[PDB]
Structure 1
Amino acid sequence: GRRRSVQWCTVSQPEATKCFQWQRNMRKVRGPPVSCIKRDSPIQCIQAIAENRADAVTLDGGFIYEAGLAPYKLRPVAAEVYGTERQPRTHYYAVAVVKKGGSFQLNELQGLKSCHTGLRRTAGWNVPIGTLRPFLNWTGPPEPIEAAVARFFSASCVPGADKGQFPNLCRLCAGTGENKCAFSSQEPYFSYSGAFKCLRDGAGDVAFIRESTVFEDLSDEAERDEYELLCPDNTRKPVDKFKDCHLARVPSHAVVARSVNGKEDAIWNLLRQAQEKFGKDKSPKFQLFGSPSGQKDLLFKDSAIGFSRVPPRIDSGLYLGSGYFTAIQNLRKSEEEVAARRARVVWCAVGEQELRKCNQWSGLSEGSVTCSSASTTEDCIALVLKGEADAMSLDGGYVYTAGKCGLVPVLAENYKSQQSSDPDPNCVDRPVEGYLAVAVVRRSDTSLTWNSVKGKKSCHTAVDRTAGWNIPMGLLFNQTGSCKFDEYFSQSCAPGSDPRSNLCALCIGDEQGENKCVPNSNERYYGYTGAFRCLAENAGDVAFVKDVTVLQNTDGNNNEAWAKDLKLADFALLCLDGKRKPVTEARSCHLAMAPNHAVVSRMDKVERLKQVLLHQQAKFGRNGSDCPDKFCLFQSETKNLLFNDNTECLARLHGKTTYEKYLGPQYVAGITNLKKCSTSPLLEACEFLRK
């Protein structure tokens, strides 16, 4: 009984009052119901919801962070939309408003008077204090950052600060008696409009608010030109040029709920209806996004125009975005701890074997490389978005997903070039030449042809990888038009698929027989090597891999049991012309050319990453000083851990620094078409964030 009634948590009396009106109008029109829980602060509401005593609460970005921590672990389910109907946006701008007359710039605020929306709020605290840090001369913890702020500004109103401990921080506040410097409407200088009033009254010199506040609060535009903006370029521009004069671009306030049984569906149901019925000018009897005269921003932001549903994959960290998320965390760190983390590279391992190899690397990196890890490649990408990881080597298929998530290629895996040169001295600058995606079959099955491969059993490296999937399936899809990929072959092993599907049938999990179809090295049939073993052991009739995979796994080149006797002659390639050729003629018999695997990272990490990786490969690379004496980066024994084992070196992108430029027009077009049939949650997640 999850759709009984949505319990909305309020943090004040008139909030409870408006909520009660909401409740009657919803019943007043036979809509999805809602009940009103009373608390006295955002924190109490987060707690309430966490322990199943409330369902939903709207929070500022700064309290979205708080709410997502343990033990609470809540998540944004719906985002407030701002702007207009023509140009809606799920973000706003933290700005610094001043009076037109003074002549100080943002970098000249020492000894001045500041008005803040509230402690720990996005526009009122996290952004401005983050921006002003270099000027703060804060020695770091354990001295609380507040103390440095109390010394920087001669006096401010920061609602919710400990006036006893940080009295300067509560000085300008206007609250009366116990309501002085309170985190609520009782304090007239609380929130966006309060902080703007704090400035208007002349109490403060600067107000840290959002871009709209000045337009919501001043009707006549003559008064609006009495105010100015401080730009981070230490210039002053009019209040209409916020797009070119802001301290940060930040994610809209959002409705949070539990991550488990939070009644997300019921919640979104109520919201959509509430919005349609009581949205902007839908009915005068009730206004979802309006507050009574002396009130502002009750339940939701006034002048919001609706909500947008937050895709399921997104948690508090993903929602906040890498910039803002790590900026908040940084506020409790010293400038040396922050600089150390900026200098180190956190790799993301996929599965315990990669982590294992990663740690070995870590121990020998002299503080430059550390390790993170997850069980899928998509979870790792997510970690990179959240900043708890920095980099990894990816197949071209995942470079697409990474690129649509904002990530970028930095270096590429360079493989034994087309018999061009010796162990190349200039490997690092040799442009990549791609590798060959092929279809391998057993020599004995003399009947198997490209034309007759449909309906047979298939072995793939994984879903969404270049050679194992995007290229074969793209070819098959371009014939028929069916998005029913699990109907192309009788059975397959295609890790990353639905375990109950026929695409998982041939998979065999780990030695114990667990982790079947898991898209990581624990699955014995995962990857280049695994998809070939899938064929050698006669599980499928065709393995979609690259040609060197066969070379590397036969003729005693792999002394592992399943392969120790495999001869290159026992296998053949399928040509698209319907012919079949020996593996050695792959250049004249392959499905397509695949772009090299590449290391991807956040834009902020590119330069550091490049320097570290170059250095590290000079030590542990192919001709690394410490390889093979100590450690080799590109070795693992046909297991392709972290990097392909046949990597010659990591090479320069030669200007192809975007996924589109790196993957190529045709390939990107190919995957985009494939993706009409189905996209991942990560992909849905990132499209929401990109908007």
Structure 2
Amino acid sequence: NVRWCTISQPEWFKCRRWQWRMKKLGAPSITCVRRAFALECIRAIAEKKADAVTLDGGMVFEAGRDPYKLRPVAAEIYGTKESPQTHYYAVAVVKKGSNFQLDQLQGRKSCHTGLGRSAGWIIPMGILRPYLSWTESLEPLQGAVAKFFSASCVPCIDRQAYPNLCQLCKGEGENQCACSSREPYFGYSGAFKCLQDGAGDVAFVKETTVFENLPEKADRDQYELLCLNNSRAPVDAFKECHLAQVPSHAVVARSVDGKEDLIWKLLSKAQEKFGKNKSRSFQLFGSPPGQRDLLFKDSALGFLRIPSKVDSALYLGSRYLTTLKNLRETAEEVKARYTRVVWCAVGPEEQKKCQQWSQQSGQNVTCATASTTDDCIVLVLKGEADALNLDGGYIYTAGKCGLVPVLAENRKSSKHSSLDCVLRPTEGYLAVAVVKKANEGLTWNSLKDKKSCHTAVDRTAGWNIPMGLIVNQTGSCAFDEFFSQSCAPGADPKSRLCALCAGDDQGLDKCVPNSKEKYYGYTGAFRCLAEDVGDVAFVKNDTVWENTNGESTADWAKNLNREDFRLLCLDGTRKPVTEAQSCHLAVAPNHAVVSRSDRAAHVKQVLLHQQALFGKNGKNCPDKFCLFKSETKNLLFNDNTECLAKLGGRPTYEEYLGTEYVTAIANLKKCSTSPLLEACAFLTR
């Protein structure tokens, strides 16, 4: 049983018509909950009084927020049968023979589909905003818009407060300018009817609205499209004369106990039975004259199922998310947001370092925190954060979600002193497998059923290199059953890969992938080996050196003689820590700062500026703040980092990491699926 939320009597009548029509096809059953508007349904679903409803992108946004916390489980697909699309275009339709252009809309009368709707509100108001003369302190956007156009019809608007924005609305009193089918001028088709009846000079609807209302070209010849360059165009030239491409309408459900399986089941069979061109009796994507788009959009081809990790912000995307959120902020807030760089911190300790950086940077750098690196990637994707420095295996994940490399970590080399660190090339680190010397008979061959220590899952040295090699050599994909017990932060806490993880000093958050887990990272995985919790540690060369022989002042690593450890070589021999060059697993590319394509240049410029103040030969280091020092913790950047080096021209994730490593990651990735990887797949549609 799925409870569908309807916001009107004509929508309720279709649901009920769909409910009876379902029964004979066998499960699931559909219930028709009656509400008045979109937010009521949002609240109904959140309160478990209903299960599904289809919203427009502006509503999708609001439904994802607290305290609703709803996610889009399926999206409507538009377009043709052979040429589908899962987005649409917001356009401005004018009647042919008008002298106004897009700039000349002040003092005109307009038609809108709804307040806070994609094509009808959000999209057109982000374009008109310079013409608005909005002084944000005196009134809201609705107040600036009210004095911009003369009369109008924008349903859902406060009729009592902005009567001119409801003045052109064709509704009957105290139901006129309503947020549903009650107002005849509501919706895309209702907006077109407002233009067609000559009430408004322009209607803001989608690209197919004029095609669905005027079947013959002769009547369609009397309309035009206002383009962005302040020109005009014919209605079939929408793909060149639109305002923005907006993501399609999605069905939403609860994040927890959402009934998404039943919802999809029901949606799949309905679309297969009464879809577009499927039956004579019932049309799912077909609704009555005078009341279009009931439940779903009219002439929608079907439903595209959305991946579990994709939320409402991810579904909508940073581009739409910017424009929506930018309308909510002021010009100066918007200005300041683009200027500031928001760094993403993984964990508690990193956040503290970032906050110190922020205050020392005079709020030039701002922080955001996530508990994992993956969460931070997601925040970068959402636009909530701007950047973070990442290990190569995470860079793969970020690049597959479209983030690009900006600057790489560059430490002290053996050759140059000449060429500046910024202009000096990265050398790459050596991936090693370290053991205690006192456990003789431990070779690379005798590795099965031993205890292991990894920096984290998906990382280069602690994960991708040894597990990729082991999978290849075993010829199996069950890495969970290779070692007897491990500590690989990022695995299932109830699995055996988390079995040796410590948690904090209270022992909570065991196997978490951040600095609060005792055995996390380069430092923690060595510590795991050093304290004899595991038999092998997969880390880099530098870690062994930095944590032995008086280098580390930490009490666990303070009494460590470097001659008590060996390096397992891939030829079955052991070697001392001085011959890492002849005994390593692979060479890994250095950790780099990733960012979004449009933020990359700004982030780069800013990071160069910050490096001069707080870096290795920083002006404020070491008396004020040192960006690369974290008390051997490697918070934000590795403590050994000499500077952040510039990369070459255009490099993608594949170019930075390298074909061989990318393919190596690729083959290892076939053994297990990542939800985030599935979600980024869908976002790069």
Provide the TM-score with structure 2 as the length reference: 0.96
CA distance in 2 between counterparts of 1:542 and 1:243 reads 58
| Residues 613-667 of structure 1: per-residue CA shift (max 9 Å, x gap) | 1111111101001111011100112210011111111111212432122222222
Once structures 1 and 2 are overlaid, which stretch shifts more, 141-150 or 106-115? 106-115
| Residues 305-335 of structure 1: per-residue CA shift (max 9 Å, x gap) | 1212222222222222112123222212210
| Equivalent residue, structure 2, for 1:537 | 531
CA distance in 2 between counterparts of 1:66 and 1:103 reads 38
Once structures 1 and 2 are overlaid, which stretch shifts more, 474-483 or 366-375? 474-483
1:521–1:12 distance in 2 versus 1, CA, 3 Å:
same
- For the pair 1:149 / 2:145, whether they are aligned, the reply is yes
- Any unmatched runs of 5+ in structure 1? none
| Equivalent residue, structure 1, for 2:617 | 623
Match of 1:462, as an amino acid? Answer: A
- The equivalent position to 1:209 in structure 2, one of 205, 211, 214, is 205
- For the pair 1:421 / 2:424, whether they are aligned, the reply is no
CA distance in 2 between counterparts of 1:28 and 1:686 reads 38
State the Cα RMSD in Å: 1.8
- For the pair 1:275 / 2:287, whether they are aligned, the reply is no
- After TM superposition, the structure 1 = structure 2 runs for residues 503-514 of structure 1, keeping only pairs within 5 Å, are 503-514=497-508
Per-residue deviation at 1:545? 1.0
Contact 1:431 1:654 in 2 (8 A): no
Per-residue deviation at 1:601? 1.6
Once structures 1 and 2 are overlaid, which stretch shifts more, 250-259 or 98-107? 98-107
Match of 2:262, as an amino acid? Answer: A
CA distance in 2 between counterparts of 1:449 and 1:238 reads 74
Does the residue aligned with 1:685 lie in a helix, a strand or coil?
Answer: helix
CA distance in 1 between counterparts of 2:651 and 2:137 reads 39
Match of 1:208, as an amino acid? Answer: F
1:647–1:172 distance in 2 versus 1, CA, 3 Å:
same
Per-residue deviation at 1:103? 4.8
| Equivalent residue, structure 1, for 2:568 | 574
| Equivalent residue, structure 1, for 2:26 | 30
Does the residue aligned with 1:413 lie in a helix, a strand or coil?
Answer: strand
- The equivalent position to 1:489 in structure 2, one of 475, 483, 486, is 483
| Equivalent residue, structure 2, for 1:644 | 638
CA distance in 2 between counterparts of 1:573 and 1:230 reads 69
| Equivalent residue, structure 2, for 1:454 | 448
Per-residue deviation at 1:224? 3.2
Once structures 1 and 2 are overlaid, which stretch shifts more, 112-121 or 627-636? 112-121
| Residues 146-189 of structure 1: per-residue CA shift (max 9 Å, x gap) | 11112222332211212322222123222233333222223222
| Equivalent residue, structure 1, for 2:671 | 677
Per-residue deviation at 1:225? 4.1
CA distance in 2 between counterparts of 1:433 and 1:205 reads 64
| Equivalent residue, structure 2, for 1:300 | 296
Contact 2:8 2:180 in 1 (8 A): yes
CA distance in 2 between counterparts of 1:226 and 1:482 reads 67
Match of 2:402, as an amino acid? Answer: G
Does the residue aligned with 1:454 lie in a helix, a strand or coil?
Answer: coil
CA distance in 2 between counterparts of 1:89 and 1:648 reads 48
Does the residue aligned with 2:529 lie in a helix, a strand or coil?
Answer: helix
Contact 1:119 1:161 in 2 (8 A): yes
| Equivalent residue, structure 1, for 2:599 | 605
CA distance in 2 between counterparts of 1:589 and 1:498 reads 32
- The equivalent position to 1:289 in structure 2, one of 276, 285, 290, is 285
| Residues 567-586 of structure 1: per-residue CA shift (max 9 Å, x gap) | 22222222223333322222
- The equivalent position to 1:665 in structure 2, one of 655, 659, 667, is 659
Does the residue aligned with 2:445 lie in a helix, a strand or coil?
Answer: helix
Per-residue deviation at 1:100? 3.5
- For the pair 1:470 / 2:476, whether they are aligned, the reply is no
- For the pair 1:480 / 2:474, whether they are aligned, the reply is yes
Per-residue deviation at 1:261? 2.2
CA distance in 1 between counterparts of 2:665 and 2:103 reads 48
| Residues 53-88 of structure 1: per-residue CA shift (max 9 Å, x gap) | 111111111111122222222221211111233333
Contact 2:195 2:201 in 1 (8 A): yes
Match of 2:350, as an amino acid? Answer: E
1:439–1:29 distance in 2 versus 1, CA, 3 Å:
same
CA distance in 1 between counterparts of 2:424 and 2:634 reads 22
Question: Identity, % of aligned pairs?
Answer: 70
| Equivalent residue, structure 1, for 2:51 | 55
- For the pair 1:356 / 2:352, whether they are aligned, the reply is yes
Per-residue deviation at 1:142? 5.2
- After TM superposition, the structure 1 = structure 2 runs for residues 176-575 of structure 1, keeping only pairs within 5 Å, are 176-417=172-413, 419-422=414-417, 426-575=420-569
Contact 2:392 2:588 in 1 (8 A): yes
- Any unmatched runs of 5+ in structure 2? none
Does the residue aligned with 1:678 lie in a helix, a strand or coil?
Answer: coil
Does the residue aligned with 2:185 lie in a helix, a strand or coil?
Answer: coil
CA distance in 2 between counterparts of 1:398 and 1:426 reads 27
CA distance in 2 between counterparts of 1:316 and 1:398 reads 23
The structure 1 segments of at least 4 consecutive aligned residues displaced by more than 6 Å after TM superposition are none
Contact 1:361 1:369 in 2 (8 A): yes
- For the pair 1:20 / 2:29, whether they are aligned, the reply is no
CA distance in 1 between counterparts of 2:358 and 2:403 reads 23
- For the pair 1:166 / 2:162, whether they are aligned, the reply is yes
CA distance in 1 between counterparts of 2:234 and 2:565 reads 72
Contact 2:184 2:290 in 1 (8 A): no
Q: Between Structure 1 and Structure 2, how many residues are aligned?
A: 685
Does the residue aligned with 1:363 lie in a helix, a strand or coil?
Answer: helix
Match of 2:15, as an amino acid? Answer: C
Does the residue aligned with 2:580 lie in a helix, a strand or coil?
Answer: helix
Contact 1:141 1:332 in 2 (8 A): no
Contact 1:390 1:601 in 2 (8 A): yes
CA distance in 1 between counterparts of 2:230 and 2:640 reads 52
CA distance in 1 between counterparts of 2:24 and 2:208 reads 33
Contact 2:400 2:677 in 1 (8 A): yes
Once structures 1 and 2 are overlaid, which stretch shifts more, 56-65 or 506-515? 506-515
Match of 2:459, as an amino acid? Answer: R
Match of 2:678, as an amino acid? Answer: E
Once structures 1 and 2 are overlaid, which stretch shifts more, 472-481 or 376-385? 472-481
1:211–1:627 distance in 2 versus 1, CA, 3 Å:
same
Does the residue aligned with 2:239 lie in a helix, a strand or coil?
Answer: helix
Match of 1:68, as an amino acid? Answer: G
Contact 1:410 1:610 in 2 (8 A): yes
Does the residue aligned with 2:369 lie in a helix, a strand or coil?
Answer: strand
CA distance in 2 between counterparts of 1:669 and 1:210 reads 43
